[PDB]
Design a protein around this ligand. Structure first.
Ligand code: CL
Ligand code: CL
Ligand code: CL
Ligand code: CL
Ligand code: CL
Ligand code: CL
Ligand code: CL
Ligand code: CL
Ligand code: CL
Ligand code: CL
Ligand code: CL
Ligand code: CL
Lengths: 449, 449, 449, 449
């Protein structure tokens, strides 16, 4: 009777086959609770768990056969169990609703997915932290407005990304905690009428706790929005790092080149070596953001309790989980195999970036910063008008700006001296970077457990 | 050499196989232009067109074989042609870039897709217009704030949706016009170096014109954003109609019930008959919006010219084209097979909705509207305090509010009289509705051609 | 020199005057650290803190005078201090960047704002929890697909919203923790060169800790995205509750009416009483979501470190903070003053919603659920074809469906009996609702501290 | 009675004062139609138009006084007219609803706003087209993946942006057409009951036509979504151009520097000259996108007809109209006053970008492209391994790759020769660029009228 086109638009089995195992696992747990509730005889339970375990095997062996009438994974497994053991299968449905199987399964899938994602995320952070430890002596320009600002260590750069990524890791753990709440036993919205043992369900399925209200457990998708939100910000961080590496990979900047494994050429232009890995990653930010936008829209203005609209969550979660997994591993390969050009990073170190240091120089000699700033500004301009860099002005030139300049300004013109000024926690001085590295190694240790 | 994970993240063949035919068609057109440009001998052209036509057959017969190395459809067809005719295949690549094949193919796919979508959209509008013509005598409540406002014809309701949908149709035609501009011959960004005959390409591929600048033709995706944008607004309209029908389908409202073909029951609650068709449609608004959001993000801040980030467009377009096709046809089935309850729509017609008419009554007798409004307000409240509807107050009751009320107020209390006040173009009077119906039939006639 | 139009587009003083106080407070803290770093003499510090305190007074008395050249609050306060104490003011700028003042100020503003928001959020949850305790005996329909499902307690409904809102409260606390990290002392990106005492800054400004990397502290806006994200989900929850109350406020449903303080009439239609409060709230979901979308877009693909693009964060945060504050308080008024119609909620309780209970009845007598479900389905249909409700079928009618039905089915037809089946934790049975109420009172107690 | 906080959240006068004039203008038009409908005496009309004209003066002189009770502009003007002429003012409300004043006013405001925006947009395109005509001999690198691709003319670059901006202009005109439809006379939803002369209203207010259905005219906001959508894509284009100019403004690229009027320095780093104008513009893309996202969300799932949720449209439209106006003018200043470095653009022209030309060279001599591509690839690599550019390999070196290379390959190594290959329409050859310039001058001529 169902209109074929609507039935097709209604089918979620194509993607939600990814929930085949957690669905059996959840059915198994419920079968045991039903036996304890007196709905199944221990003899029936056996037939049921045996059938379910068999269906699990069919899916893992890639031999399960999806039929036309299967509008979703839940309907598939129920059909299969019935054709295996008959009428007994039908007892498993007692007090159970699809509205609760759907969030229970997706949460089970998400818990497993987060572990994998976490593992990869931590490996990415580690890769950045460990390379930062190895390349701690490298100094290059730091930018604001994409204009050379003040010199910083390449390790300080790798660590800013590592640090941001660590907050992503942290948010990921917080979301996992609310994901880890058992919704099974909420029924279609009013709860379970059998005095089902929810605690037994909880430990069996390995959730940290149970849902507090049946109407909310079945209507909410905060856990989907949260996931999508944190994943989006994680992607945002990756788009910024991509933007950085792609620009630094240009021939104009020349700071680095990715490995051949993470680049591709051009079937038309023979000279090309393109940073595809990073561009792909940068574009995924939009992809994941679209998933977040869609779910927020799907939810807005919907009435309590369950609504068929909610079915759009599955595909969005699965797609973002797969994007993360791929994106994180690729990012790792890139960071660990890319080749920096210590020579070019060094050449890019030009005197004008030391203009702030030149002003502090005068400040140390007594001049108030505002004046010191304008004086340093003049030297920058004098050198420009003269067609040279500031370190090439003469001492009398500096005196023409302020007699406060003494022969010892020569010490201002030393990049190692520049970065080494920033010892206060968080700065780019080498001792601060080593401190950060240690802090991050600890943070990771704690994130892992 | 390419990292396997990055290569997988980079593959677009899974979805872009949908472009198999337009890609051959575009290669065929270019092969003929290359022969005219002196790159191919008429003998070579023959081998080439014959090979291409053969590959086209493989795809349509569902026998084409995708190999590991095929990162996209373009790479697949090029590989296949080479293994069919050898070295000659390689001449087809002359002066051609993937950056141009990609937008040429997607535009070719979009042109064909729009025709199908248009056909369905027009059928949906027709369905609403024709039912509105049949059910023109039905009157029910009209709402603002979901509170009963003034009575309107059910046909006036069906037509508001038809009208909005017609603007969707119109926007769809405008987008098609800019989609219909040939980008082939832009190369990787600098244009074509062979003095290729772009006009020949244009007519051959059936585009209305050619791109003006090669750098823009290869960098832009306005045609994707536009499509996604209009599709999103179209979905918005459908979410509002869905919201309406779902609410009207409630037992509390009781105005209508969808057919069984567009509903489904509940495996747990035996009494349920749910309007799945409409909820599915309403949720797609979010889905399509997410696609729009993702592409806008993918594009923002990207430098000229082509960037690998752009590859995310394919899957978003294909997904939205398929959503539209399904959603439009389902919407049509729903509107044409749903059953209204003329009796309940009639029962819902209550006197308080005529309070505005009661104020105009006094206005006709000389009272300024502001005063007429407060007087009518009092009658509404008097009736409430008295526990009756306003048409049940006595004439002396109305006189206690304003002596201006005469025995002829009885004429105010007639719903057919209410709606029939709105004869000015656009209103709910029957003559206005018939006018609208005629206007829409014409609009559709013009949209179709 | 600056183009007047660009300067206007660049000015953020209109909105960022809201940061006038935290900016002084942050300048005060830095002045004291500069004295300890040897940049200011204790005599200079005095003049500085005295001047700053004076500027603080000007803003709080609403007498501060913004001049043309003030492109932001930071520039305003610096100008004012200089015209008050002269050259000494300029020493305060030593080692300080706008890039760090900007995030330090906004975080200070956000910390204060979250406290207010939290206070209001907790009051909203309390309002729902306490009313749920008072109206615990009320039963009405529960819905899925906006179709009557199974009976539930009105208190179970109020609590689903309370529960969701509690997760919003929890997420709000997590975000506050990362907001509470001091970024001051990061300079323009390389850190602070004076060995400034960041710990002194931390305790002085009351942050829980300090930023780990100067490049990240100045480039990131995770704290803005997080805030916007959680606020958006909070709004989503409020849009669903609004959708519920507006629908329940219809005359068709008739379950409740809001108070006059939270409604408005119509200048045209005298009978109208509209639920403006709820519609306003529902629409804010979109408003806040737009703010989230904008910031995510502003950030995507931006290079390290600071970029002027980031300046868009201020107005988005301030607007959402003000929306939350207003929305939360209004929501509270609505819930606490609305009037339910116990009589209509009772009348809406119809027999078909007990069809699931009727199937369990047969299940208890031995029949497998699948069969019990179809049997109950038949009774629903028999009653329909007969034009009566199911509780009106005769016992022999039920026997015609299944001889398993005995005279005691009469017990199935009792709504208090229906809801009382759900005693398992989370359900709608009265003992479960009282449990929830207790749990939520505790949760709130912990959230508050 | 209205809760003060809800009343504040409900007030739209702060921003919708921008609609003060179009609101009077719309009231004036309706007053004249009411007189013709027999509701006002010609004597009353006079008092009314005189009062309205007076209120118009108050607003334009900046002396109108907003009172507490004014929840919107419509309520303000109605109050003011009443206190000026008394009871007569109240007759103007006859048959009129706020639901129609609101869309009529906003459309009137949008029509005027589009004209201004169009004027500025066309000036921006002109600025790019005319500079492209002046700097037509300049050649620099063209990029894909931000990697040097093939040489192109700077004019070809300016024109790709001009061309995209022209589509923005075109879409803007299409939106204006649907904006130009008169909604006045739709009442609260059922239409107008006075047989009001809508055609008279149309010409009087200068709309191109009238709305077809009263229910749609009052419920829709397609005209807002459309506007926001096109404005967003326009901003997208501007974010890409900004991304380009900011990168080209780097010292690493060194192709250009903006004028001082469109840059700003750093209060901390004396050497800085930052491209604020472009970064501000790039960030507005997100701002405008957020406005689009919010309105789409506000609309999704809302029931017919009017809902208070719709009130969020005003502020979004006004904000985007003001952003466009500022952004467009600033963009113009930037393009017209920026200074390119013809010398550096020339230096950036390196031999590897000619590798495609080198392959075509062999193709002309008979070699199939695929082979020609790999041969050219080898030369690129040989030169790398040798530490020189390809134009420095010896003829015998090229022979070692393919004996097909003859002394005349020297002609391949000429950049003017490179770009001049692209004469086919749209390419970067000089004759193609002059063609584009002419086409765009015409397009603008037509857009203007
Ligand atoms: Cl047993
Ligand atoms: Cl090196
Ligand atoms: Cl000296
Ligand atoms: Cl020939
Ligand atoms: Cl009927
Ligand atoms: Cl009389
Ligand atoms: Cl001292
Ligand atoms: Cl009552
Ligand atoms: Cl019996
Ligand atoms: Cl007269
Ligand atoms: Cl020059
Ligand atoms: Cl030779």
């Amino acid at each position: 009777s169902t209109d074929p086109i609507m039935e097709k638009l209604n089918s979620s089995i194509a993607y939600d086959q990814r929930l085949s195992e957690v669905d059996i696992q959840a059915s198994i747990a419920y079968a045991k609770a039903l036996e304890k509730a007196g709905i199944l005889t221990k003899t029936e339970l056996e037939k049921i768990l045996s059938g379910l375990e068999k269906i699990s095997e069919e899916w893992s062996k890639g031999v399960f056969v999806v039929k036309q009438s299967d509008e979703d994974i839940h309907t598939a497994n129920e059909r299969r169990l019935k054709e295996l053991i008959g009428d007994i299968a039908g007892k498993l449905h007692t007090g159970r609703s699809r509205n609760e199987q759907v969030v229970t399964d997706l949460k089970l899938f998400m818990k497993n997915s987060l572990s994998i994602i976490s593992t990869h995320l931590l490996q990415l952070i580690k890769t950045l932290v460990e390379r930062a430890a190895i390349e701690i002596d490298v100094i290059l320009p730091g930018y604001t407005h994409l204009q050379k600002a003040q010199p910083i260590r390449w390790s300080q750069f790798l660590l800013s990304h590592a640090v941001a990524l660590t907050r992503d890791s942290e948010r990921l753990g917080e979301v996992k905690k609310r994901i880890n709440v058992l919704p099974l036993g909420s029924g279609a919205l009013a709860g379970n009428p059998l005095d089902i043992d929810r605690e037994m369900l909880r430990s069996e399925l390995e959730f940290a706790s149970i849902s507090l209200n049946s109407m909310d457990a079945i209507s909410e998708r905060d856990f989907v929005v949260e996931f999508l939100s944190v994943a989006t910000l994680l992607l945002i961080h990756l788009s910024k790092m991509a933007e950085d590496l792609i620009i630094y990979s240009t021939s104009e900047f020349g700071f680095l080149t990715l490995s051949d494994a993470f680049s591709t050429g051009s079937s038309l232009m023979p000279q090309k070596k393109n940073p595809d890995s990073l561009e792909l990653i940068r574009s995924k930010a939009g992809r994941v953001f679209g998933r977040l936008a869609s779910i927020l829209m799907v939810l807005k203005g919907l009435p309590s309790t369950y609504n068929k609209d909610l079915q759009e969550d599955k595909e969005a979660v699965i797609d973002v989980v797969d994007t993360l997994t791929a994106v994180l591993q690729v990012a790792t390969g890139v960071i660990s195999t890319l080749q920096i050009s210590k020579e070019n990073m060094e050449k890019a170190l030009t005197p004008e970036m030391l203009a702030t240091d030149l002003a502090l120089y005068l400040v140390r000699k007594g001049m108030p910063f505002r004046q010191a700033h304008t004086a340093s500004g003049k030297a920058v301009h004098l050198a420009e008008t003269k067609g040279i860099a500031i370190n090439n002005l003469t001492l009398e030139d500096l005196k023409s700006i302020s007699p406060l300049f003494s022969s010892d300004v020569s010490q201002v013109f030393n990049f190692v001296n520049s970065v080494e000024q920033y010892t206060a926690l968080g700065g780019t001085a080498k001792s601060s970077v080593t401190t950060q590295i240690e802090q991050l190694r600890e943070l990771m240790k704690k994130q892992k457990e």
